[PDB]
Amino acid sequence: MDVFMKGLSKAKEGVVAAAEKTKQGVAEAAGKTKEGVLYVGSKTKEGVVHGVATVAEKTKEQVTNVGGAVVTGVTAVAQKTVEGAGSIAAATGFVKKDQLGKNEEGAPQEGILEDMPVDPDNEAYEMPSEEGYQDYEPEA
């Protein structure tokens, strides 16, 4: 289940496949170097030039067959890129979250004035309006 183990067992499959091939390449190379020390009036320089010249003709039939393969492969990667874009959309689109409205206070004072006209000397004229009750000793 660990997506990591798979990627690991997948690489080992390539290292082994490459070994069988790399191990088969040195095998032929060994016998090839064996003829190197031995001269061969048959393989002359002019003969080598004609060899690479012939392999250049087949290389055309190969790139032609694979030429249609690389085109199809790139097409698969093309649709594989647009899909990866979805992941980018998430990185930019942060996981939305509906629950808060951020409203500390829209400065709901009560009027344009500082709303502090109240006088500390006596609130207003003289305490509540009442009916005088008592404030002057003499009749007036």
Side-chain angles (χ1 to χ4, degrees):
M1 281 68 206
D2 295 57
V3 180
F4 291 92
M5 281 290 167
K6 284 180 175 285
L8 198 86
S9 160
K10 186 177 181 77
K12 188 178 283 193
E13 183 177 346
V15 177
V16 173
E20 293 176 1
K21 198 174 181 179
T22 312
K23 185 178 181 179
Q24 186 176 344
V26 292
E28 293 176 1
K32 199 174 185 298
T33 309
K34 198 176 179 66
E35 182 178 79
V37 297
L38 189 82
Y39 279 87
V40 194
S42 199
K43 186 176 273 75
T44 300
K45 306 179 188 304
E46 184 178 13
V48 172
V49 173
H50 180 49
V52 297
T54 309
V55 174
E57 292 177 2
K58 292 178 180 179
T59 309
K60 289 178 180 289
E61 293 176 1
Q62 187 178 98
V63 301
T64 44
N65 281 128
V66 182
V70 290
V71 172
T72 52
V74 173
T75 311
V77 184
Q79 293 177 5
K80 200 174 185 294
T81 312
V82 300
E83 291 176 1
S87 182
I88 305 176
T92 312
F94 304 88
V95 278
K96 202 175 177 65
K97 37 163 62 271
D98 194 320
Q99 43 163 262
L100 293 168
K102 197 175 184 300
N103 297 309
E104 69 303 312
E105 248 167 307
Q109 293 180 49
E110 187 177 48
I112 40 271
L113 302 178
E114 292 178 62
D115 195 56
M116 199 204 294
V118 66
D119 308 302
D121 56 353
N122 54 182
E123 205 296 316
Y125 297 83
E126 291 181 1
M127 334 205 93
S129 59
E130 63 175 352
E131 292 177 0
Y133 202 103
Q134 72 195 126
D135 186 53
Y136 36 87
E137 262 283 31
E139 294 82 355

